[PDB]
Design an enzyme around this catalytic site. Structure first.
Site, mmCIF file in Angstrom:
data_model
loop_
_atom_site.group_PDB
_atom_site.id
_atom_site.type_symbol
_atom_site.label_atom_id
_atom_site.label_comp_id
_atom_site.label_asym_id
_atom_site.label_seq_id
_atom_site.Cartn_x
_atom_site.Cartn_y
_atom_site.Cartn_z
ATOM 1 N N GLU A 1 -20.757 14.677 31.986
ATOM 2 C CA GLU A 1 -20.892 14.291 30.566
ATOM 3 C C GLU A 1 -20.512 12.828 30.247
ATOM 4 O OE1 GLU A 1 -17.968 15.723 27.875
ATOM 5 O OE2 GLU A 1 -19.464 16.362 26.386
ATOM 6 N N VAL A 2 -21.177 12.262 29.258
ATOM 7 C CA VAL A 2 -21.007 10.880 28.903
ATOM 8 C C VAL A 2 -20.570 10.824 27.460
ATOM 9 C CG1 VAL A 2 -22.063 8.589 28.709
ATOM 10 C CG2 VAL A 2 -22.833 10.091 30.500
ATOM 11 N N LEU B 1 -22.524 11.458 24.116
ATOM 12 C CA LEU B 1 -23.768 10.681 24.192
ATOM 13 C C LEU B 1 -24.818 11.369 25.066
ATOM 14 C CD1 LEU B 1 -22.516 7.071 24.544
ATOM 15 C CD2 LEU B 1 -23.305 8.143 22.446
ATOM 16 N N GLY B 2 -24.394 12.192 26.013
ATOM 17 C CA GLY B 2 -25.303 12.923 26.836
ATOM 18 C C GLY B 2 -24.529 13.827 27.747
ATOM 19 N N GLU B 3 -25.220 14.860 28.237
ATOM 20 C CA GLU B 3 -24.640 15.926 29.075
ATOM 21 C C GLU B 3 -24.928 15.699 30.566
ATOM 22 N N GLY B 4 -24.922 16.785 31.326
ATOM 23 C CA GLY B 4 -25.269 16.711 32.725
ATOM 24 C C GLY B 4 -24.629 17.805 33.542
ATOM 25 N N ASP C 1 -34.093 7.766 41.580
ATOM 26 C CA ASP C 1 -34.429 8.637 40.466
ATOM 27 C C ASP C 1 -34.840 7.856 39.249
ATOM 28 O OD1 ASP C 1 -34.857 11.287 39.495
ATOM 29 O OD2 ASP C 1 -32.827 11.513 38.733
#
Ligand SMILES: COc1cc(C(=O)N2CCC(N3CCN(C)CC3)CC2)ccc1Nc1ncc2c(n1)N(C)c1ccccc1C(=O)N2C
Ligand SMILES: [Cl-]
Length: 257
Positions: free
Chosen positions: A18-19, A11-14, A117
């Site tokens: 990660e998700v 669903l998304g990185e980072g 944030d």
């Protein structure tokens, strides 16, 4: 892939964070899971959260090096993806999201948490487009036993960060989060960020402080929301409007399509 849950899709990185979409084989319920390998603190904050405009925490599992944080899934994606570049979004949608954002921030501040944030990437949508404030990896406690502590660490994202954070040794937490809500509101209504950073060496910021509202993005913004932005994006944090006073603002209370 973790106990009862299958890890179906990214669903998304980072930054090592990660998700994944996680579905329970037994029960079919789908949640989101953040895979990381400091986070003690994050988990501690996440366990405090119980509000409809804040991402829920379901629990955690360590499996060797990897920690799995199980969290509410926001299947509508981010507010970022609802903002059209150079346009924004219809003012009534922007107002409703702003209402929800403020409800979330009031909640967090009332439990003495600062997010630090706030930006459209971190503002997620459920399936009925309810906004949820997500990502507590930078969050911290600024009020404990009814005593405020000032912050000194630099964090955030420059275009969203309040100017006191670049100028002062120590600053109050709450006006920083308010400032970043006003940059969010600007982005929703104009589809563009007003400056790279809120410093006097940045010409667009200088221009705002001289009230050159015939320039972009301000000229795209109707006069009522713009009057609110004039109260939020005030350089001195102790003159900046507070959330109680945002709630009395004319645009904030304007009925909209
Ligand atoms: C179905 O739920 C979501 C859908 C989407 C989305 O629009 N996608 C999914 C990813 C997709 N591509 C991605 C790359 N891939 C190889 C191809 C497919 C593009 C479209 C994005 C997010 C979804 N839900 C979601 N809920 C909670 C979050 C969170 N996200 N993440 C990733 C977060 C993002 C930012 C800050 C916090 C979170 C978060 O903590 N959670 C728990
Ligand atoms: Cl933008």
């Amino acid at each position: 892939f973790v106990e009862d849950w299958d890890l179906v899709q990214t669903l998304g990185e980072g930054s090592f964070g990660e998700v994944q979409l996680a579905v329970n084989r037994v029960t079919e319920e789908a949640v989101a899971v953040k895979i990381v390998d400091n986070i003690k603190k994050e988990i501690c904050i996440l366990k405090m959260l119980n509000h409809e405009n804040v991402i829920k925490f379901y629990g955690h599992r360590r499996e060797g090096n990897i920690q799995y944080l199980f969290m509410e899934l926001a299947s509508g994606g981010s507010l970022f993806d609802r903002i059209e570049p150079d346009i924004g979004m219809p003012e009534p949608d922007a107002q409703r999201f702003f209402h929800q954002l403020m409800a979330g921030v009031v909640y967090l501040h009332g439990i003495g948490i600062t997010h630090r944030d706030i930006k459209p990437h971190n503002l997620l949508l459920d399936e009925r487009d309810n906004l949820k404030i997500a990502d507590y990896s930078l969050a911290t406690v600024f009020r404990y036993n009814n005593r405020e502590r000032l912050l000194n660490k630099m964090c955030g994202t420059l275009p969203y960060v309040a100017p006191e954070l670049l100028k002062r040794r120590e600053f109050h937490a709450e006006p920083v989060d308010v400032w970043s809500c006003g940059i969010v509101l600007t982005a929703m209504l104009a589809g563009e960020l007003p400056w790279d950073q809120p410093s006097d060496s940045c010409q667009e910021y200088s221009d705002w402080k001289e009230k050159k509202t015939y320039l972009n993005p301000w000229k795209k913004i109707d006069s009522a929301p713009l009057a609110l932005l004039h109260k939020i994006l005030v350089e001195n944090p102790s003159a900046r409007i507070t959330i109680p006073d945002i709630k009395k603002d004319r645009w904030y209370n304007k009925p909209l399509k």
